[PDB]
mmCIF file of all heavy atoms in Angstrom:
data_model
loop_
_atom_site.group_PDB
_atom_site.id
_atom_site.type_symbol
_atom_site.label_atom_id
_atom_site.label_comp_id
_atom_site.label_asym_id
_atom_site.label_seq_id
_atom_site.Cartn_x
_atom_site.Cartn_y
_atom_site.Cartn_z
ATOM 1 N N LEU A 1 52.060 29.940 7.111
ATOM 2 C CA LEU A 1 53.347 29.352 6.782
ATOM 3 C C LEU A 1 53.243 28.638 5.436
ATOM 4 O O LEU A 1 54.178 28.654 4.635
ATOM 5 C CB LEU A 1 53.724 28.366 7.886
ATOM 6 C CG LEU A 1 55.243 28.299 8.038
ATOM 7 C CD1 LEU A 1 55.744 29.539 8.771
ATOM 8 C CD2 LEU A 1 55.629 27.080 8.868
ATOM 9 N N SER A 2 52.090 28.013 5.195
ATOM 10 C CA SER A 2 51.840 27.326 3.942
ATOM 11 C C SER A 2 51.835 28.302 2.771
ATOM 12 O O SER A 2 52.371 27.982 1.716
ATOM 13 C CB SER A 2 50.518 26.566 4.031
ATOM 14 O OG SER A 2 50.196 25.997 2.777
ATOM 15 N N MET A 3 51.242 29.492 2.924
ATOM 16 C CA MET A 3 51.167 30.451 1.823
ATOM 17 C C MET A 3 52.548 30.937 1.405
ATOM 18 O O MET A 3 52.813 31.098 0.216
ATOM 19 C CB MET A 3 50.345 31.673 2.238
ATOM 20 C CG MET A 3 48.907 31.285 2.551
ATOM 21 S SD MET A 3 47.920 30.826 1.103
ATOM 22 C CE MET A 3 46.456 30.202 1.964
ATOM 23 N N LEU A 4 53.427 31.170 2.381
ATOM 24 C CA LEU A 4 54.740 31.736 2.111
ATOM 25 C C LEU A 4 55.708 30.697 1.554
ATOM 26 O O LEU A 4 56.785 31.055 1.084
ATOM 27 C CB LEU A 4 55.256 32.488 3.346
ATOM 28 C CG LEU A 4 55.100 31.754 4.682
ATOM 29 C CD1 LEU A 4 56.378 31.008 5.027
ATOM 30 C CD2 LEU A 4 54.767 32.742 5.797
ATOM 31 N N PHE A 5 55.323 29.418 1.604
ATOM 32 C CA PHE A 5 56.034 28.349 0.918
ATOM 33 C C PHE A 5 55.300 27.866 -0.335
ATOM 34 O O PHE A 5 55.936 27.348 -1.248
ATOM 35 C CB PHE A 5 56.260 27.193 1.885
ATOM 36 C CG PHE A 5 57.649 27.193 2.471
ATOM 37 C CD1 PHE A 5 57.890 27.614 3.786
ATOM 38 C CD2 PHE A 5 58.705 26.751 1.665
ATOM 39 C CE1 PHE A 5 59.201 27.600 4.289
ATOM 40 C CE2 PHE A 5 60.010 26.726 2.169
ATOM 41 C CZ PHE A 5 60.257 27.153 3.478
ATOM 42 N N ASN A 6 53.979 28.025 -0.404
ATOM 43 C CA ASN A 6 53.207 27.602 -1.566
ATOM 44 C C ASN A 6 53.482 28.517 -2.760
ATOM 45 O O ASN A 6 53.253 28.131 -3.905
ATOM 46 C CB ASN A 6 51.717 27.604 -1.209
ATOM 47 C CG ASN A 6 50.859 27.096 -2.357
ATOM 48 O OD1 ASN A 6 51.173 26.087 -2.986
ATOM 49 N ND2 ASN A 6 49.763 27.795 -2.639
ATOM 50 N N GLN A 7 53.973 29.730 -2.503
ATOM 51 C CA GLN A 7 54.302 30.681 -3.555
ATOM 52 C C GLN A 7 55.647 30.352 -4.209
ATOM 53 O O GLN A 7 56.010 30.972 -5.210
ATOM 54 C CB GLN A 7 54.303 32.100 -2.976
ATOM 55 C CG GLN A 7 55.428 32.285 -1.953
ATOM 56 C CD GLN A 7 55.391 33.663 -1.299
ATOM 57 O OE1 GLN A 7 54.655 34.550 -1.720
ATOM 58 N NE2 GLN A 7 56.192 33.850 -0.254
ATOM 59 N N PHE A 8 56.391 29.388 -3.652
ATOM 60 C CA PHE A 8 57.686 28.992 -4.179
ATOM 61 C C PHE A 8 57.529 27.936 -5.276
ATOM 62 O O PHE A 8 56.494 27.273 -5.358
ATOM 63 C CB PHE A 8 58.585 28.515 -3.031
ATOM 64 C CG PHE A 8 59.336 29.664 -2.404
ATOM 65 C CD1 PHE A 8 58.643 30.639 -1.670
ATOM 66 C CD2 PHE A 8 60.722 29.773 -2.581
ATOM 67 C CE1 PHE A 8 59.328 31.750 -1.167
ATOM 68 C CE2 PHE A 8 61.405 30.885 -2.076
ATOM 69 C CZ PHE A 8 60.706 31.879 -1.385
ATOM 70 N N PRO A 9 58.556 27.775 -6.124
ATOM 71 C CA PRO A 9 58.582 26.829 -7.233
ATOM 72 C C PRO A 9 58.580 25.367 -6.781
ATOM 73 O O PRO A 9 58.848 24.472 -7.581
ATOM 74 C CB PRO A 9 59.847 27.168 -8.023
ATOM 75 C CG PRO A 9 60.777 27.751 -6.960
ATOM 76 C CD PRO A 9 59.799 28.522 -6.075
ATOM 77 N N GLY A 10 58.277 25.118 -5.507
ATOM 78 C CA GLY A 10 58.192 23.776 -4.960
ATOM 79 C C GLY A 10 57.561 23.817 -3.565
ATOM 80 O O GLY A 10 58.002 24.574 -2.703
ATOM 81 N N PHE A 11 56.525 23.005 -3.345
ATOM 82 C CA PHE A 11 55.874 22.898 -2.048
ATOM 83 C C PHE A 11 55.176 21.550 -1.916
ATOM 84 O O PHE A 11 54.514 21.101 -2.851
ATOM 85 C CB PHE A 11 54.869 24.037 -1.902
ATOM 86 C CG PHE A 11 54.123 24.008 -0.592
ATOM 87 C CD1 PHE A 11 54.829 24.060 0.616
ATOM 88 C CD2 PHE A 11 52.723 23.930 -0.585
ATOM 89 C CE1 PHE A 11 54.136 24.042 1.833
ATOM 90 C CE2 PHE A 11 52.028 23.911 0.636
ATOM 91 C CZ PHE A 11 52.735 23.968 1.845
ATOM 92 N N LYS A 12 55.323 20.899 -0.756
ATOM 93 C CA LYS A 12 54.694 19.617 -0.489
ATOM 94 C C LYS A 12 53.808 19.675 0.754
ATOM 95 O O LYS A 12 52.600 19.477 0.637
ATOM 96 C CB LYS A 12 55.806 18.573 -0.420
ATOM 97 C CG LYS A 12 55.321 17.130 -0.304
ATOM 98 C CD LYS A 12 55.082 16.748 1.154
ATOM 99 C CE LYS A 12 55.013 15.230 1.306
ATOM 100 N NZ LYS A 12 55.056 14.839 2.727
ATOM 101 N N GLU A 13 54.387 19.943 1.931
ATOM 102 C CA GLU A 13 53.643 19.998 3.189
ATOM 103 C C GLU A 13 54.345 20.883 4.221
ATOM 104 O O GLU A 13 55.460 21.352 4.007
ATOM 105 C CB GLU A 13 53.464 18.590 3.773
ATOM 106 C CG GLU A 13 52.185 17.916 3.263
ATOM 107 C CD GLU A 13 51.958 16.559 3.920
ATOM 108 O OE1 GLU A 13 52.963 15.875 4.214
ATOM 109 O OE2 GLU A 13 50.775 16.211 4.125
ATOM 110 N N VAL A 14 53.673 21.098 5.355
ATOM 111 C CA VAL A 14 54.174 21.882 6.477
ATOM 112 C C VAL A 14 54.012 21.068 7.759
ATOM 113 O O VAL A 14 53.139 20.202 7.840
ATOM 114 C CB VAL A 14 53.424 23.217 6.549
ATOM 115 C CG1 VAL A 14 53.739 23.985 7.829
ATOM 116 C CG2 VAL A 14 53.768 24.095 5.352
ATOM 117 N N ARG A 15 54.850 21.349 8.758
ATOM 118 C CA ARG A 15 54.857 20.634 10.024
ATOM 119 C C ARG A 15 55.021 21.626 11.175
ATOM 120 O O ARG A 15 55.974 22.399 11.205
ATOM 121 C CB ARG A 15 56.000 19.611 9.977
ATOM 122 C CG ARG A 15 56.321 19.006 11.344
ATOM 123 C CD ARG A 15 55.135 18.205 11.872
ATOM 124 N NE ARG A 15 55.453 17.582 13.159
ATOM 125 C CZ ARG A 15 54.598 16.828 13.855
ATOM 126 N NH1 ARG A 15 53.372 16.591 13.397
ATOM 127 N NH2 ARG A 15 54.970 16.302 15.017
ATOM 128 N N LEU A 16 54.086 21.606 12.130
ATOM 129 C CA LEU A 16 54.145 22.459 13.302
ATOM 130 C C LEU A 16 54.481 21.651 14.554
ATOM 131 O O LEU A 16 54.328 20.429 14.576
ATOM 132 C CB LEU A 16 52.825 23.210 13.489
ATOM 133 C CG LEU A 16 52.458 24.097 12.295
ATOM 134 C CD1 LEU A 16 51.213 24.887 12.665
ATOM 135 C CD2 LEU A 16 53.550 25.108 11.954
ATOM 136 N N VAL A 17 54.937 22.353 15.599
ATOM 137 C CA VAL A 17 55.299 21.764 16.878
ATOM 138 C C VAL A 17 54.592 22.530 17.997
ATOM 139 O O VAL A 17 54.608 23.761 18.002
ATOM 140 C CB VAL A 17 56.824 21.785 17.026
ATOM 141 C CG1 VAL A 17 57.292 21.546 18.458
ATOM 142 C CG2 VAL A 17 57.429 20.705 16.131
ATOM 143 N N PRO A 18 53.970 21.823 18.952
ATOM 144 C CA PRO A 18 53.229 22.428 20.050
ATOM 145 C C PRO A 18 54.167 23.095 21.055
ATOM 146 O O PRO A 18 55.360 22.796 21.097
ATOM 147 C CB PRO A 18 52.462 21.273 20.694
ATOM 148 C CG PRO A 18 53.372 20.074 20.432
ATOM 149 C CD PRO A 18 53.925 20.376 19.043
ATOM 150 N N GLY A 19 53.622 24.004 21.869
ATOM 151 C CA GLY A 19 54.398 24.709 22.882
ATOM 152 C C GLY A 19 55.379 25.707 22.262
ATOM 153 O O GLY A 19 56.262 26.210 22.957
ATOM 154 N N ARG A 20 55.230 25.992 20.964
ATOM 155 C CA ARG A 20 56.140 26.845 20.215
ATOM 156 C C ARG A 20 55.385 27.755 19.253
ATOM 157 O O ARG A 20 54.219 27.525 18.937
ATOM 158 C CB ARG A 20 57.110 25.958 19.423
ATOM 159 C CG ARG A 20 58.251 25.421 20.287
ATOM 160 C CD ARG A 20 59.234 26.543 20.607
ATOM 161 N NE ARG A 20 60.366 26.054 21.398
ATOM 162 C CZ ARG A 20 61.510 26.728 21.539
ATOM 163 N NH1 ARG A 20 61.675 27.908 20.949
ATOM 164 N NH2 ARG A 20 62.500 26.221 22.275
ATOM 165 N N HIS A 21 56.078 28.801 18.794
ATOM 166 C CA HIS A 21 55.573 29.741 17.803
ATOM 167 C C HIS A 21 56.729 30.351 17.016
ATOM 168 O O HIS A 21 56.535 30.850 15.913
ATOM 169 C CB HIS A 21 54.808 30.864 18.499
ATOM 170 C CG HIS A 21 55.666 31.626 19.476
ATOM 171 N ND1 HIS A 21 55.766 31.363 20.844
ATOM 172 C CD2 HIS A 21 56.486 32.668 19.157
ATOM 173 C CE1 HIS A 21 56.638 32.266 21.318
ATOM 174 N NE2 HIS A 21 57.084 33.064 20.329
ATOM 175 N N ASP A 22 57.935 30.308 17.590
ATOM 176 C CA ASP A 22 59.121 30.907 16.992
ATOM 177 C C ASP A 22 59.861 29.898 16.115
ATOM 178 O O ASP A 22 60.859 30.248 15.487
ATOM 179 C CB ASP A 22 60.043 31.466 18.088
ATOM 180 C CG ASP A 22 60.375 30.473 19.206
ATOM 181 O OD1 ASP A 22 59.868 29.329 19.174
ATOM 182 O OD2 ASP A 22 61.147 30.872 20.106
ATOM 183 N N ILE A 23 59.379 28.650 16.062
ATOM 184 C CA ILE A 23 59.981 27.596 15.258
ATOM 185 C C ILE A 23 58.891 26.756 14.599
ATOM 186 O O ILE A 23 57.774 26.663 15.107
ATOM 187 C CB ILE A 23 60.944 26.735 16.096
ATOM 188 C CG1 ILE A 23 60.246 25.967 17.226
ATOM 189 C CG2 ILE A 23 62.045 27.607 16.705
ATOM 190 C CD1 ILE A 23 59.773 24.585 16.778
ATOM 191 N N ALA A 24 59.225 26.143 13.461
ATOM 192 C CA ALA A 24 58.323 25.295 12.696
ATOM 193 C C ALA A 24 59.136 24.424 11.742
ATOM 194 O O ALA A 24 60.365 24.462 11.761
ATOM 195 C CB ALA A 24 57.339 26.173 11.917
ATOM 196 N N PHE A 25 58.454 23.640 10.903
ATOM 197 C CA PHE A 25 59.098 22.778 9.926
ATOM 198 C C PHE A 25 58.313 22.807 8.613
ATOM 199 O O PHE A 25 57.094 22.965 8.634
ATOM 200 C CB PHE A 25 59.206 21.358 10.487
ATOM 201 C CG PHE A 25 60.046 21.221 11.739
ATOM 202 C CD1 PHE A 25 59.523 21.610 12.982
ATOM 203 C CD2 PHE A 25 61.347 20.701 11.662
ATOM 204 C CE1 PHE A 25 60.305 21.492 14.142
ATOM 205 C CE2 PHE A 25 62.120 20.569 12.824
ATOM 206 C CZ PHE A 25 61.600 20.964 14.063
ATOM 207 N N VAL A 26 58.990 22.655 7.470
ATOM 208 C CA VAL A 26 58.323 22.711 6.165
ATOM 209 C C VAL A 26 59.029 21.839 5.133
ATOM 210 O O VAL A 26 60.258 21.787 5.101
ATOM 211 C CB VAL A 26 58.233 24.154 5.635
ATOM 212 C CG1 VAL A 26 57.556 24.147 4.265
ATOM 213 C CG2 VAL A 26 57.421 25.060 6.558
ATOM 214 N N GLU A 27 58.243 21.163 4.290
ATOM 215 C CA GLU A 27 58.747 20.346 3.195
ATOM 216 C C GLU A 27 58.468 21.016 1.859
ATOM 217 O O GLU A 27 57.389 21.559 1.624
ATOM 218 C CB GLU A 27 58.115 18.954 3.173
ATOM 219 C CG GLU A 27 58.177 18.255 4.526
ATOM 220 C CD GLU A 27 57.393 16.944 4.543
ATOM 221 O OE1 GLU A 27 57.372 16.259 3.495
ATOM 222 O OE2 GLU A 27 56.819 16.631 5.608
ATOM 223 N N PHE A 28 59.469 20.961 0.988
ATOM 224 C CA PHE A 28 59.400 21.549 -0.335
ATOM 225 C C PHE A 28 58.941 20.462 -1.310
ATOM 226 O O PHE A 28 58.591 19.369 -0.872
ATOM 227 C CB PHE A 28 60.787 22.094 -0.649
ATOM 228 C CG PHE A 28 60.798 23.352 -1.482
ATOM 229 C CD1 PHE A 28 60.446 24.568 -0.880
ATOM 230 C CD2 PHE A 28 61.180 23.317 -2.826
ATOM 231 C CE1 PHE A 28 60.515 25.761 -1.612
ATOM 232 C CE2 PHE A 28 61.244 24.507 -3.564
ATOM 233 C CZ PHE A 28 60.924 25.729 -2.954
ATOM 234 N N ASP A 29 58.939 20.744 -2.617
ATOM 235 C CA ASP A 29 58.438 19.817 -3.633
ATOM 236 C C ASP A 29 58.872 18.369 -3.367
ATOM 237 O O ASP A 29 58.082 17.444 -3.544
ATOM 238 C CB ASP A 29 58.959 20.264 -4.999
ATOM 239 C CG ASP A 29 58.333 19.510 -6.173
ATOM 240 O OD1 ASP A 29 57.289 18.845 -5.970
ATOM 241 O OD2 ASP A 29 58.913 19.608 -7.276
#
C-alpha cells in the first residue's frame, strides 16, 4: 500500500486496521 502511494507527488504515512483486508487508510504529503 505504501509503494502505490509513495509513487505519488505526495506521501507521508499509511494506516492499517485489524480484522480487515478490503479497507485501509493512507496519508498524503
Side-chain angles (χ1 to χ4, degrees):
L1 211 76
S2 174
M3 297 289 171
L4 46 95
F5 261 104
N6 183 45
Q7 66 184 350
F8 273 68
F11 179 58
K12 187 273 197 169
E13 271 184 326
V14 171
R15 167 64 178 180
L16 301 186
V17 165
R20 280 287 182 163
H21 59 266
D22 51 358
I23 64 90
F25 298 77
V26 179
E27 310 173 35
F28 214 75
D29 189 15

